[PDB]
Amino acid sequence: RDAQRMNILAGRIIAETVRSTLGPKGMDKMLVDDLGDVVVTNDGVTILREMSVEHPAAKMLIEVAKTQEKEVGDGTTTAVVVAGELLRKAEELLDQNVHPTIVVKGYQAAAQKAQELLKTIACEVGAQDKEILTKIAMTSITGKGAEKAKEKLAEIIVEAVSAVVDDEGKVDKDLIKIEKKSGASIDDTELIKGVLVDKERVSAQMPKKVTDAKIALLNCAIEIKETETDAEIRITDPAKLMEFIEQEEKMLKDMVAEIKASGANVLFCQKGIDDLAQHYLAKEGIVAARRVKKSDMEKLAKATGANVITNIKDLSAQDLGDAGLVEERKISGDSMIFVEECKHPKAVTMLIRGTTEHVIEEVARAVDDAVGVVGCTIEDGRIVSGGGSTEVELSMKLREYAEGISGREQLAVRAFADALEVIPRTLAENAGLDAIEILVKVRAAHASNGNKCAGLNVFTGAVEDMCENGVVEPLRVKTQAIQSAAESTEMLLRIDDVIAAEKLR
């Protein structure tokens, strides 16, 4: 009859099943297909994409989560579960013979005003503090599960993002190189000041370590060229096979003698090296590597100030590549070459270690999420305490603002703030604590003159200072969460008809 009742109802099942996924404590359900692939995980962004949705209307509720993946990159789970409760609480409002036009205007007014009230609650931090920046760093790493070296590697990431803070305060995911290698444990991580390279010498006869060397870039393979039009050759004189062989080497020998006289010890050519050219480079003692990534001549020259070279004939002094300190040492396994730039450092490298190839890849992703959240605090210099400390105080703040809005429709803006208790309640279900018993004491600590930083403790259940335990997050995670939930629900509550579109996936 109501039609809309079934539409919003389909969205609750998608949000209810993924309601206990917040945090590491909580079971997970599987949706095995006809074939078979029992694969589960606590991640939320994965189970949603890998799900067979029934009705097409449910896709609009999860489409907003895809935008937060690139913008904020964290807290997407908390953004969709809060919107589901708003639809449930809205059921009682619609039963009061109230038209959606009066309810849609209440959320926009409360959401627009809530963004201005949450600014006077957040704290103020500096763009270079370490005592406070180290706590948030461990929060975005401990979520995985590793604990043997959760604090040691944290400082390595804090000291890395601090040496690449430009004047404007932006971050570029390019100058910060990444290196991983399976080791004996995760505690084997070590910081690096220069840039490394995995490409090794093509042969052992070439020099090993050369102190104070001048790098040289090249992009030109040693092969025979061919034209577009057809042009074949014919040879019917085997007596001239051992004659031209002496002249062909002269053309290649002179080409190898140019890079040696230009003023360079090592070499890094993009394209591969010919089998016959390896003997020429090893004869003179010039380090070289075959088949180098095309994305190396651009980032290396940008960090060291070199210049890409396409033709070997031309190579003056300015065309050479500078270097700071070259060295080739071991790392408890395979050796690697180092290319530092102490005279003008402009890049940072990280050597992540693990016990298995599957662990080193997970530790790397933890840094991608850590280098992104730290930038949100440097560009804004504002953070908020976790543990539902922002919603418990914000929920009671709009109570005074709702009183100003006279009329009978005031019951709508109040219901929107009451739905903000899903975070402190969801964390209590898996913990095994009655929400009705703990949600009453939290208000006492935030009565009026109380500290706005107080919150809950998922590790013990008590209530202490969040900053003392190390639980803080940027304010943008809370703004985008409530903002998307207030705007995304509009497409679900404003519906009032059925679309007869033919063939809609």
Structure tokens at 429: 């279900």
Strand pairing report for 349-354 and 336-340: unpaired
**In sequence order, what are the residues at sequence separation of 6 or more whose Cβ sits closer than 8 angstroms to the Cβ of residue 345?**
163, 193, 194, 324
The terminus-to-terminus CA distance of the chain in angstroms comes to 25
Helix (H) or strand (E) holding 430: helix 422-431
C-alpha–C-alpha distance, residues 409 and 104, integer Å: 11
Q: Is 174 a catalytic residue?
A: no
Catalytic residue (choose from 43, 174, 314, 418): 43
Burial of 208 (0-12, 13-18, 19+ CB in 10 A): exposed
Quote the DSSP letter at residue 349.
E
- Strands (DSSP E) contained in 169-306 are 179-182, 190-192, 195-197, 217-218, 268-269
Helix (H) or strand (E) holding 338: strand 336-340
Catalytic residue (choose from 21, 74, 76, 377): 76
Which of 291, 311, 293, 295 has its CA nearest to residue 303?
Answer: 295
Catalytic residue (choose from 21, 77, 189, 426): 77
Reduced 3-state DSSP string for 439-450: CCHHHHHCCCCC
C-alpha–C-alpha distance, residues 247 and 501, integer Å: 75
Q: What is the largest CA-CA distance in the chain?
A: 108
Burial of 224 (0-12, 13-18, 19+ CB in 10 A): exposed
**In sequence order, what are the residues at sequence separation of 6 or more whose Cβ sits closer than 8 angstroms to the Cβ of residue 50?**
31
* Structure determined via: cryo-EM
C-alpha–C-alpha distance, residues 323 and 6, integer Å: 67
Q: Is 129 a catalytic residue?
A: no
Q: Is 43 a catalytic residue?
A: yes
CB 387 within 8 A of CB 458: yes
Taking phi over 0 as left and psi of -120 to 50 as alpha, with beta for the rest, 332 belongs to left
CB 289 within 8 A of CB 202: yes
**In sequence order, what are the residues at sequence separation of 6 or more whose Cβ sits closer than 8 angstroms to the Cβ of residue 294?**
270
Which of 387, 379, 402 has its CA nearest to residue 114?
Answer: 402
C-alpha–C-alpha distance, residues 67 and 481, integer Å: 11
CB 56 within 8 A of CB 505: yes
Q: What share of the chain is helix, strand, coil (3-state, %, to 5)?
A: 45, 10, 45
Which of 475, 480, 441, 490 has its CA nearest to residue 125?
Answer: 475
Structure tokens at 369: 């999420």
C-alpha–C-alpha distance, residues 30 and 13, integer Å: 14
Quote the DSSP letter at residue 176.
B
Rounded to the nearest angstrom, the gap between the alpha carbon of residue 163 and the centroid of all alpha carbons in its chain is 19
Q: Which amino acid is at 162?
A: S
Coil, strand or helix: which one is 153?
A: helix
CB 341 within 8 A of CB 324: yes
C-alpha–C-alpha distance, residues 357 and 368, integer Å: 18
Helices 100-117 and 410-418, packing angle to 10 deg: 60
C-alpha–C-alpha distance, residues 288 and 266, integer Å: 6
Structure tokens at 361: 């890849």
CB 287 within 8 A of CB 266: yes
Rounded to the nearest angstrom, the gap between the alpha carbon of residue 431 and the centroid of all alpha carbons in its chain is 29
C-alpha–C-alpha distance, residues 134 and 155, integer Å: 7
Q: Is 229 a catalytic residue?
A: no
How many residues make up the chain in this entry? 505
**What resolution, expressed in A, was reported for this entry?**
6.4
CB 265 within 8 A of CB 207: yes
Catalytic residue (choose from 28, 322, 369, 380): 369
